Design an enzyme around this catalytic site. Structure first.
Site, PDB file in Angstrom:
ATOM      1  N   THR B   1       0.848  -1.226   0.000  1.00 54.15           N
ATOM      2  CA  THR B   1       0.000   0.000   0.000  1.00 54.15           C
ATOM      3  C   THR B   1       0.865   1.250   0.000  1.00 54.15           C
ATOM      4  O   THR B   1       1.895   1.301   0.670  1.00 54.15           O
ATOM      5  CB  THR B   1      -0.900   0.066   1.251  1.00 54.15           C
ATOM      6  N   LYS B  33      -8.504   3.640  -3.447  1.00 59.49           N
ATOM      7  CA  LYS B  33      -8.045   4.093  -2.142  1.00 59.49           C
ATOM      8  C   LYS B  33      -8.183   5.598  -1.933  1.00 59.49           C
ATOM      9  O   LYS B  33      -7.798   6.092  -0.869  1.00 59.49           O
ATOM     10  CB  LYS B  33      -6.599   3.654  -1.903  1.00 59.49           C
ATOM     11  N   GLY B  45      -7.600   9.842   1.532  1.00 60.52           N
ATOM     12  CA  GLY B  45      -7.186   8.496   1.191  1.00 60.52           C
ATOM     13  C   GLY B  45      -6.990   7.695   2.459  1.00 60.52           C
ATOM     14  O   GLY B  45      -6.942   8.243   3.562  1.00 60.52           O
ATOM     15  N   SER B 124       2.749   0.864   3.196  1.00 60.76           N
ATOM     16  CA  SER B 124       4.005   0.130   3.266  1.00 60.76           C
ATOM     17  C   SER B 124       5.050   0.739   2.343  1.00 60.76           C
ATOM     18  O   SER B 124       6.250   0.671   2.633  1.00 60.76           O
ATOM     19  CB  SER B 124       3.761  -1.332   2.896  1.00 60.76           C
TER      20      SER B 124
END
Ligand SMILES: [Mg+2]
Ligand SMILES: [Mg+2]
Lengths: 174, 174
Positions: B1, B33, B45, B124
């Site tokens: 992500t 997202k 988001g 991430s």
């Protein structure tokens, strides 16, 4: 566990394995993981406790009656109650459903998802069946029932938790 | 992500990847997202469960109506409820939001943060996109949309959990 759904040429189907594992041991091989709902207008499948899905499927029909059978709106109301209620929050299952309009997924996190090209694959074997159904859909003219059948046999050969007992519920809207 | 936000020359944007990982397997590549809120006045988001963010985004609009759309005060009330409620405490997500006034971050620990120069990067892959956006902002005249787009493609090449599907919501206040 594995479950699959496919839509082509006015035909949509859902198919699922009969395996019920307990630890390293098979508990039951003939489980019916696929069924019809809302005057047979809807087909659905589930991965989880057989009662946990039977409860969610009944409330989903009540969401359809309030929304006059709309598939999307009835699902968001079901996913909304699922994460919300302290009783339903204990429920752990993955629901799949489709009608002539579209196919989509439901989860205990309350997430709802419509896959690309309404291609659903779930269960421990679901990634494997997805890779098989993806290949036949692009490289062959096979009908949606023919692809869901072959993709499930492959996931059963691969996934130890999936077996070759099958149940299918096709829906034709043409 | 990965998710990114940038503000320049009267323009602010938010951008995010579509990857949804499950273990070592990709679950869905097209996830949205990024979305708009509060009469499209605000862009936001999220990194986390798609239902977990949709719940927090709804309450944040209620915090805006109580505060007449103030961004900062509505966020502290949301972060205050998030750590507080036993139901919200179970939620696990990272929220990002910005309007013409400022960009800031929200967390499940209740922390709220405004990045230096309103530069948000989370997920991430967020450290990777932050290093890319930091370089272009200082060394180039590119518009905030141009930087958030290029920074996200780099994080997707780097982070295995991030992909190149993109969604963006730009806001122009000039
Ligand atoms: Mg097997
Ligand atoms: Mg990648």
């Amino acid at each position: 566990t594995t479950i699959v759904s496919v839509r082509r040429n006015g035909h949509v189907v859902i198919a699922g394995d009969g395996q019920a594992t307990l630890g390293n041991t098979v508990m039951k091989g003939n489980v019916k993981k696929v069924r019809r709902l809302y005057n047979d207008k809807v087909i659905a499948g589930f991965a989880g406790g057989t009662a946990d899905a039977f409860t969610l499927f009944e409330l989903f029909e009540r969401k359809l009656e309030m929304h006059q059978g709309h598939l999307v709106k009835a699902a968001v109301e079901l996913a909304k109650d699922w994460r919300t209620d302290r009783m339903l929050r204990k429920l752990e299952a993955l629901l799949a459903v489709a009608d002539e309009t579209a196919s989509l997924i439901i989860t205990g996190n309350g997430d709802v998802v419509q896959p690309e090209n309404d291609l659903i694959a779930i269960g421990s074997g679901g990634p494997y069946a997805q890779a098989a159904a993806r290949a036949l859909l692009e490289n062959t003219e096979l009908s949606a029932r023919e692809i869901a059948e072959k993709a499930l046999d492959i996931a059963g050969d691969i996934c130890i938790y999936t077996n070759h007992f099958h149940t299918i519920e096709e829906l034709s809207y043409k």
